[PDB]
Design a protein around this nucleic acid. Structure first.
Lengths: 55, 87, 214, 105, 110, 93, 36
RNA sequence: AUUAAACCUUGUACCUUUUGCAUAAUGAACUAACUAGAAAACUUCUAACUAAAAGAAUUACAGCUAGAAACCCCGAAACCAAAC
């Protein structure tokens, strides 16, 4: 997969913005996915339970 | 022939149990039997009774004339309990 | 002069590099000669032993073939007896197997069972030297030696390892979880680590294949 | 079961408590294995609680014999000659401590 | 054809004058003379770390574990790492040298 | 029933023999070999089930196809009759 | 492989029975339960 | 239970079947061995990776991949082909 190209102005017209620099110094770090997207997935289970997962 | 060593080992124990019941072993003194320490037992014996005994004197009291003869016979190939016995 | 190694691939900024003592087998006292950096995404993965446990089961079971057979009542000239050759073959995804290998590498390093070496070359071919050296460095009773490629592995090491049952010599492509677990300590050449890292790090952007990669 | 089993009357060994109470238990024997999950609890017991029991009750001879053993086992011998055997296979420290206290009493 | 040298024990006890040995080694590494903020000196330099760690290990007798090697970013960690003792004595070995009472018997058949 | 009156001789097994020692080696041929050779290619055994698994009927049917021409006439007839029972059991019950 | 000892468990409680009951497991087991 | 084997006191053999009942009805001289539950379409659970997932043939607007998870035995009167 090609890495995202550097853009003169962020956010990108679609709306993509790379992770903010400097990274936060919190004890917990959330890395981006291989697709350079936030690792948040909406999920529904049992046909009635809505869920969201951070991986 | 049934396979397995546990079954063969189990039967050997089964045979031993029957043999022991038929022919109980002759009694033997705990001194000869394993896990015996005369010095440790005497200390425990005195503490168990909650009484103070002089180790040397108590051993002499335990010492008997017959015991000395056996040791002397082995020695050929010591204070008796008579004095304490009278008191 | 310390031997300094850096990860060829880009280490994450938020992740610090993993480091270990570079060693050489040339001499008994050559325990530490350099400092090397190891990719956190490879050598600092979470210790997921169930994946390792699954891989070990897969390793034992995908080769499992039972040849037991018996004649049933209809075939008598057993109600539920073995019926001919039976196999248990199944395949784990390459992502899981690579992850399982990644997990195993971290455990050995963290448990001080992994020894990174520059090369396998030995001053002598005597098997005694290798066993004594393992005792000298307090290695486990079983030591696994890995080289970059089978063809180029030194002759001296071959003789020492070939004659030793508990010391097994394998190429880089021959690495597997079962051997690592069976062997108390692992000895890896520096080129092999890069070779393993490349394949393990290749999993990045794992295009689902419509045909073989070749 | 009562018809098919033995019975006795209430009795004391030698009127033990009339003058002074004497502990019947006289000897303890322990077998351990250096590398055995079953004996781990007993092994941990040796580190921490065996000494306290020994100090509390010095009138009982305690034998601890770590040896190649399939199952750890404890043997308790009493003054009257009664001997009781208990297997320590795969038992925790807390369980072992409670059992020993019962044996002493 | 090479004869292995004798094995050494893995037990290391922090020196009573640990600071004196550490500072002397730091002076030995390269002419430092213990400049202020010595504890915070970064070890990221490969050459400096190799000489400092190798020299300290030989004299002090304790070696940085591979697991803990990357943690040794600063001298302060090294000083803390050396001050913690390491004992090779087994639990049974400690028990043997613990004034065993007369009623307690230990026999190691392994 | 009755049990043996003699103990079997003791037996010692070496767990570090080459077969056990090298068991599982090259199992990562594909990932470490650029996927040129799939681990399924390393299977040695009956031809009809090399790299393949199925239910008893599928295994029997595949066996017939692979070695049907090279099987004995008597065996082929027996296999045909056996297949009939297997087919009915799985596909009708 | 312990079926013999299982019978012994019933037999040991049935050793004191009289007649074929003491030697027949089919009857010995029934008597042992009834006694308890 | 007992000092005591029997006495005193208490108590309508067992399995199956009838109905949650048998003083019904079946079956058992006894010993040893042998003697009957087998499948994954979908779902939950356990994980990998994720707008992507599966080592070619598959699905997708959080999906996709992998694993685990299931359904017996004996017994007719008969019927047909080919030999004798």
């Amino acid at each position: 997969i090609p890495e995202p190209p550097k853009h003169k102005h962020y956010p990108t017209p679609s709306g993509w913005q790379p992770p903010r620099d400097p990274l936060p110094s919190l004890p917990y770090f959330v890395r981006r996915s291989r697709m350079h997207n936030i690792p948040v997935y909406k999920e529904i289970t049992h046909g009635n339970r809505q869920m969201t997962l951070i991986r | 022939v049934k396979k397995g060593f546990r079954a063969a080992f189990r039967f050997q124990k089964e045979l031993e149990r029957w043999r022991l019941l038929r022919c109980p072993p002759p009694p033997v003194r705990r001194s000869e039997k394993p896990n015996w320490d005369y010095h440790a037992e005497v200390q425990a014996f005195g503490s168990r009774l909650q009484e103070t005994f002089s180790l040397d004197l108590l051993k002499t009291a335990f010492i008997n004339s017959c015991y000395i003869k056996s040791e002397e016979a082995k020695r050929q190939s010591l204070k008796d309990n008579q004095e304490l016995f009278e008191q | 002069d310390p031997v300094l190694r850096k990860c060829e691939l880009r280490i994450p900024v938020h992740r610090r590099p993993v480091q270990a003592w570079v060693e050489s087998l040339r001499g008994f006292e050559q325990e530490r000669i350099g400092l090397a950096e190891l990719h956190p995404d490879v050598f600092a993965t979470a210790p997921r032993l169930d994946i390792v446990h699954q891989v070990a089961i897969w390793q034992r079971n995908f080769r499992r073939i039972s040849y037991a057979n018996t004649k049933t009542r209809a075939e008598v000239s057993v109600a539920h007896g073995p019926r001919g050759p039976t196999s248990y073959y199944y395949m784990l995804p390459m992502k899981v197997r690579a992850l399982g290998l990644k997990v195993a590498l971290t455990v050995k390093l963290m448990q001080d069972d992994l020894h990174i070496v520059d090369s396998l070359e030995l001053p002598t071919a005597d098997p005694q030297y290798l066993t004594e050296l393992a005792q000298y460095r307090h290695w486990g009773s079983s030591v696994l030696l890995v080289d970059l490629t089978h063809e180029e592995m030194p002759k001296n090491v071959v003789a020492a390892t070939s004659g030793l049952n508990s010391f097994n010599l394998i190429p880089a492509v021959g690495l597997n979880v079962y051997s690592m677990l069976k062997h108390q300590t692992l000895v890896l050449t520096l080129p092999s680590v890069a070779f393993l890292e490349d394949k393990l790090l290749w999993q990045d952007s794992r295009y689902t294949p419509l045909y073989p990669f070749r | 079961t009562g018809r098919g089993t033995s019975s006795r009357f209430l009795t004391s060994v030698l009127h033990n408590g009339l003058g002074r109470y004497v502990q019947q238990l006289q000897r303890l024997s322990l077998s351990l294995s250096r590398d055995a999950p079953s004996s781990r609890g007993a092994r941990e017991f040796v580190e921490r609680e065996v000494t306290d029991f020994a100090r509390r009750n010095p009138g009982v001879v305690v034998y601890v014999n770590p040896r190649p053993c399939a199952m750890p086992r404890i043997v308790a011998e009493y003054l009257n000659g009664a001997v009781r055997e208990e297997n320590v296979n795969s038992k925790s420290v807390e369980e072992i401590k409670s059992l020993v206290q019962k044996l002493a009493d | 054809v090479l004869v292995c040298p004798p094995l050494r024990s893995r037990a290391y006890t922090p020196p009573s004058d640990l600071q004196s040995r550490l500072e002397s080694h730091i002076k030995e590494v390269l002419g430092s003379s213990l400049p202020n903020n010595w504890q915070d000196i970064s070890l990221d330099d490969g050459h400096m770390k190799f000489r400092l760690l190798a020299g300290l290990a030989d004299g002090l007798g304790h070696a940085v574990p591979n697991s803990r090697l990357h943690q040794m970013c600063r001298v302060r960690d090294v000083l803390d790492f050396y001050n913690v003792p390491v004992q090779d004595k087994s639990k049974f070995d400690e028990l043997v040298a613990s004034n065993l009472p007369p009623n307690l018997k230990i026999s190691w058949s392994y | 029933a009755f049990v043996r009156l003699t103990l079997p001789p003791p037996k010692v097994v070496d767990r570090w023999n080459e077969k056990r020692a090298l068991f599982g080696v090259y199992d990562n041929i594909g990932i470490l070999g650029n996927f040129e050779k799939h681990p399924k290619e390393l299977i040695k055994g009956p031809v009809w089930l090399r790299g393949w698994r199925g239910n008893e009927l599928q295994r029997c049917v595949r066996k017939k196809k692979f070695v049907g021409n090279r099987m004995f006439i008597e065996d082929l007839h027996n296999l045909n009759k056996r297949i009939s029972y297997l087919y009915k059991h799985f596909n009708r019950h | 492989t312990d079926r013999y000892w299982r019978v012994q468990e019933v037999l040991k409680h049935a050793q004191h029975f009289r007649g074929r009951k003491n030697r027949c497991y089919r009857l010995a087991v029934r008597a042992v339960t009834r006694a308890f």
